[PDB]
DNA sequence: TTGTGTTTTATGACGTCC
DNA sequence: GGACGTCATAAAACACAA
């Protein structure tokens, strides 16, 4: 669905801090707020979406 | 350097929506 | 039969004592 010839790919710093701004804010993401960050981002919804499952299990671990 | 231990993207499997 | 949540796990990329 993402992944190609690129197994995974390093975001940007910029993008990095936004989505831990974002995170900060909080935990969870709406649709519509996804829809925008992804949008202002230059990452896919899904990508949006992947991060902060990945982000909450490391703010668990 | 460069091993090697850790962190960041990403997935499928399985679970719960109030 | 979607949407999103967990999780164990693979592989690329990085952090950094040695």
């Known amino acids: 669905t993402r992944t190609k010839d690129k197994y ?3 975001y940007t710093d910029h993008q990095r ?3 831990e701004k ?3 804010y909080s ?3 709406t649709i519509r707020r996804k ?3 992804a949008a202002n981002l230059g ?3 899904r ?4 991060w902060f ?3 909450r299990a490391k703010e668990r671990k």
Do not use: A, D, G
């Not at 990508?47 to 992947?50: E, L, M, S, T």
């Open 8 to 10: 995974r790919v390093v």
């Open 17 to 19: 801090l936004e989505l």
């Open 22 to 24: 974002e995170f900060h």
């Open 27 to 29: 935990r969870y993401i």
């Open 35 to 37: 829809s925008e960050l």
């Open 43 to 45: 990452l896919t919804e």
């Open 47 to 50: 990508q949006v979406k992947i």
């Open 53 to 55: 499952q990945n982000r």
